[PDB]
């Protein structure tokens, strides 16, 4: 419960496992795009929204 400032930040990554990454972005029909809006974030967990 702290205001955002240099030195006021604590990682939540301690003890978190499965730092997997999704394949957001990528080419379809030779066009750069965000392929699929429904992929989860890092950790295989749902994003915001």
């Amino acid at each position: 419960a702290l205001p955002f400032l240099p030195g006021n930040s604590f990682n939540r990554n301690i003890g978190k496992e499965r730092f997997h990454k999704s394949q957001h972005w990528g080419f379809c029909n030779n066009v750069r795009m965000l392929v699929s809006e429904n992929k989860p974030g890092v950790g295989g967990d749902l994003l915001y929204g």
């Binding site: 400032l5 030195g7 999704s22 957001h24 990528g26 750069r32 795009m33 965000l34 974030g41």
Partner: protein, 431 residues
């Protein structure tokens, strides 16, 4: 009115740029969805400087995230403020350079630089009056140090009068994370002296010290490092967004920091950094703010200014201060240590005051300083480059791109006239 287009290049540029946008978003009260949730009216009086309007009361950063490798940008997408950036701004190729300046500037950059130019030319023509662009990258890489330099080369031809700043990261002496670092460093600064209004030299190893001894963090990750550099990029354009007793902007330092067009390498530093045990024993005053500002440990570059002479100084301030005190300190520091300040310019220092402090803090300040101690960073890099380039080490990768050997020869030559012309001004008589 006065808009800033935030350029961005490479992994260093993206992780710096990802932290930067959330930092001013807290300043302007923009939630991860993107809508206004702040309270005060001055939090919406100059939001068009960085944000672009979209339907439904949404604010869109005027960012252009560029990277040859598509996968650094999904980590940008998967962050807290991930879905605030428009996907059409994301530009990426298919094959990276691999710390190879030659790949990113000549062969694979030339295929990607068409598409980014369409983005910025759309962003430029959107706003009425641009103040100028702003790019964050690193000199020891392949895309930011590579393509990112060809971008700056092209904009200055198109847009000669607008300003163009760079919060670059220069490689460090003690620890190096790339063996072809001095090859990319010299091939890049040669571009920076020719087409750039301002450059800010940041070194991660100088950021490493401050997290250790001034904040006393036990495990400072790269997020805290990216927080420090973003706290500086906020401090330079803050008077452009909030009112002040004594106003300033990005051009007000440009004319006033650069005595000759070749010398635009400055050394930033952030004042109100105190360890969480030191907050108990301190006093929030302006005399303390100038004391920590000018201390050589507080610098975020890799050279001691006590070796050289301070050409010009710019100290911008935040928070509602009394202006006798912010003026008597700067006369005090110019007088007491007269040897470190050049004589042919009396009154080397520039001051500015912004009433609105950073969010959650009472008083703050940001230091910009031009000194003849940056020359060691070129002197050290040059001989780190001569010792490598003599033996034709790692040259087949670079000469396999078809470039001749004489660009390197004119790369060190344009580095080495600088250090001579930099050193002449240090050894200059007043009368």
């Amino acid at each position: 009115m006065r808009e800033i287009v935030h350029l961005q290049a490479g992994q260093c540029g993206n992780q710096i740029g990802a932290k930067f946008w959330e930092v001013i978003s807290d300043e302007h009260g923009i939630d991860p969805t993107g809508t206004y949730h702040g309270d005060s009216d001055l939090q919406l009086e100059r939001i068009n400087v960085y944000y672009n309007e979209a339907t439904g009361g949404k604010y869109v950063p005027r960012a252009v995230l560029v990277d040859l490798e598509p996968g650094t940008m999904d980590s940008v997408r998967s962050g807290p403020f991930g879905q605030i950036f428009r996907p059409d701004n994301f530009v990426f190729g298919q094959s990276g350079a691999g710390n190879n300046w030659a790949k990113g500037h000549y062969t694979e950059g030339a295929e990607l630089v068409d598409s980014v130019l369409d983005v910025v030319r759309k962003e430029a023509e959107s706003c009425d009056c641009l103040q100028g662009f702003q790019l964050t990258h690193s000199l020891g890489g392949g895309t930011g140090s590579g393509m990112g330099t060809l971008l700056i080369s092209k904009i200055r031809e198109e847009y000669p009068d607008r300003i163009m700043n760079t919060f670059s990261v220069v490689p460090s002496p003690k620890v190096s994370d790339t063996v072809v670092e001095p090859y990319n460093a010299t091939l890049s600064v040669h571009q920076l002296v020719e087409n750039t209004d301002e450059t800010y030299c940041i070194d991660n190893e100088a950021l490493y010290d401050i997290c250790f001894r001034t904040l006393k963090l036990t495990t400072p990750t790269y997020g805290d490092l990216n927080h420090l550099v973003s706290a500086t990029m906020s401090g330079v354009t803050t008077c452009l967004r909030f009112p002040g007793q004594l106003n300033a902007d990005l051009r007000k330092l440009a004319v006033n920091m650069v005595p000759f067009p070749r010398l635009h390498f400055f050394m930033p530093g952030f004042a109100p950094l105190t360890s969480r045990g030191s907050q108990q024993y301190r006093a929030l005053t302006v005399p303390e703010l100038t004391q920590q500002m000018f201390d050589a440990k507080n610098m975020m570059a890799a050279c001691d200014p006590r070796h050289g002479r301070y050409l010009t100084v710019a100290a911008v301030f935040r928070g509602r201060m009394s202006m006798k005190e912010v003026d008597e300190q700067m006369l005090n520091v110019q007088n007491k240590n007269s040897s470190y300040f050049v004589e042919w310019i009396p009154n080397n220092v520039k001051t500015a005051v912004c009433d609105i402090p950073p969010r959650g803090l009472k008083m703050s300040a940001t230091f910009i300083g031009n000194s003849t101690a940056i020359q060691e960073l070129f002197k050290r890099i040059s001989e780190q480059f001569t010792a490598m380039f003599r033996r034709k080490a790692f040259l087949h990768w670079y000469t396999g791109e078809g470039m001749d050997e004489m660009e390197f020869t004119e790369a060190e030559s344009n580095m080495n006239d600088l250090v001579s012309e930099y050193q002449q001004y240090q050894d200059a008589t007043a009368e």
